[PDB]
Antibody, heavy 215, light 214 residues
Framework: QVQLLEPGTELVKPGASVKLSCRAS????????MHWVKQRPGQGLEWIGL????????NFNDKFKSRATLTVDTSSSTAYMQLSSLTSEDSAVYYC?????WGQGTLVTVSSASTKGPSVFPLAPSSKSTSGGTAALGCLVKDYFPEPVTVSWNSGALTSGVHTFPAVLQSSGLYSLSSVVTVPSSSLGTQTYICNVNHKPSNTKVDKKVEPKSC | EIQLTQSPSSLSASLGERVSLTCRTS??????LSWLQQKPDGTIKRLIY???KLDSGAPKRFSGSRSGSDYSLTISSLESEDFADYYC?????????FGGGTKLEIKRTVAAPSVFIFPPSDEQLKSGTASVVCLLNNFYPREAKVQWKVDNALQSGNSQESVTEQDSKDSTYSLSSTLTLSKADYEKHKVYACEVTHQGLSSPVTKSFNRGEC
């Protein structure tokens, strides 16, 4: 019955502002306080404040009081959280919350970075790979923004032994990710391995054959 | 602000195991504490509220209880759906505050990582940068130390690591460490090594490759 609907994701530049919406349904909007909670990637939960939809009275956490505005549109059962003067520390999943129910959250990513397709580089089985009958090979998907990028191998024909790592934000503000697969070292001469990289946000599609090199 | 000290921050356990998480309050909160579960997929669900009342949507293997300033969440017998993050939340005072959380992971026997190292592709070198990848594969537990040495000189602040979630089938982790250097620096050096320490390794494992070779 209780539904708390939030937007998917948002990319904002430093110093800019973001106005998150939280649409509620399933109960009496004004009868409940709406909380906003922040969660930085792999971080804990932090309460930002609440607003009483009935009167508009808000109560804040001092850290956000000076930059956050909590408003409500009772006509549309929507609470809004505008956070101003964003910096990278504001990149996080922001949830709206009412007693017992949590929204799915909106991932806000603050970056001065521009859209860019990944450079895909082969992580080749050389000799320093092969763990006996097991070689590791993969693709380094570098310098793309924003996330995400999907990587598959041999057009989905290869699923076993695949590890696509969570992306990391380089100091350049661009992401980088690696996808690796462990395969029988003896299959390197009878089987071709191709990582299929698709960065839909910049529609860059790339097929890189990862070929063994042994000087 | 009312502090909530949640312990332990991390916990490894097996199916069928009994586990209790606890949150200690700095000041009296009179049972105004809830326990939240955040599934791997990010969704958050309240399990217990008012410290001891089981939320209708929550399984009976969960229960809350309080001893003075200690509030605990106990899972009678852990099931697969219980391996997640847990947070206690207090609503006695403002600002609302949360405990630091408890990440519950699957316990399995130690497994040394398979380590692989990858030289930069000549393809990448054409762009002025060099990434060297050290791959730690299918290991357990999660804790692993990876250090980069370039011509035996410990590298610092120029590498980044990434770890996958615990594997659904074998409960292992895989870790990737990437060392980034300018093409210039990369060419000013010969031996690139990645030294790994992990509980399943009785000794540090080093994988390396020479630039002035294969």
């Amino acid at each position: 019955q209780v539904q708390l609907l939030e937007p998917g994701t948002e990319l904002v530049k430093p110093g800019a502002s973001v106005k998150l919406s939280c649409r509620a349904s399933g109960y009496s909007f004004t009868s409940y306080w709406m909380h906003w909670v922040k969660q930085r990637p792999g971080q804990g939960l932090e309460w930002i404040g609440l607003i009483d939809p009935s009167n508009g009275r808000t109560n804040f956490n001092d850290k956000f009081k000076s930059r956050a505005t909590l408003t409500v549109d009772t006509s549309s059962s929507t609470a809004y959280m505008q956070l101003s003067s964003l910096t990278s520390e504001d990149s996080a999943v922001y949830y709206c919350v009412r007693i017992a129910y949590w929204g799915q959250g909106t991932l806000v990513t603050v970056s001065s970075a521009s859209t860019k397709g990944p450079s895909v580089f082969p992580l080749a089985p050389s000799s320093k790979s092969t763990s006996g009958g097991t070689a590791a090979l993969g693709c380094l998907v570098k310098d793309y923004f924003p996330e995400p990028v999907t990587v598959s191998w041999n057009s989905g024909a290869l699923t076993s032994g695949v590890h696509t790592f969570p992306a990391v934000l380089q100091s350049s503000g661009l992401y980088s990710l690696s996808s690796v697969v462990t395969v029988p070292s003896s299959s390197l001469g009878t089987q071709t391995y191709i990582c299929n990289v698709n960065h839909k946000p910049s529609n860059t599609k790339v097929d890189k054959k990862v070929e063994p090199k042994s000087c | 602000e009312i502090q909530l000290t949640q312990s332990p921050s991390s916990l490894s356990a097996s199916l069928g195991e009994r586990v209790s998480l606890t949150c200690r309050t700095s000041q009296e909160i009179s049972g105004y504490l809830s326990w939240l579960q955040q599934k791997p997929d990010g969704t958050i669900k309240r399990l217990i509220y008012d410290a001891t009342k089981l939320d209708s949507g929550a399984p009976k293997r969960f229960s809350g209880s309080r001893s003075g300033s200690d509030y605990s969440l106990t899972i009678s017998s852990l099931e697969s759906e219980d391996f997640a993050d847990y947070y206690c939340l207090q609503y006695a005072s403002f600002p609302r505050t949360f405990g630091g959380g408890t990440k519950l992971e699957i316990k399995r026997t130690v497994a040394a990582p398979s380590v692989f190292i990858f030289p930069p592709s000549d393809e990448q070198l054409k762009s002025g940068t060099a990434s060297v990848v050290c791959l730690l594969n299918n290991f357990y537990p999660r804790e692993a130390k990876v250090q980069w040495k370039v011509d035996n000189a410990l590298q610092s602040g120029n590498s980044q690591e990434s770890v996958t979630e615990q594997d659904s089938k074998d409960s292992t982790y895989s870790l990737s460490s990437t060392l980034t250097l300018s093409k210039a620096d990369y060419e000013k050096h010969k031996v690139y090594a990645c030294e790994v320490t992990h509980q399943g390794l009785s000794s540090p494992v080093t994988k390396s490759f020479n630039r002035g070779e294969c």
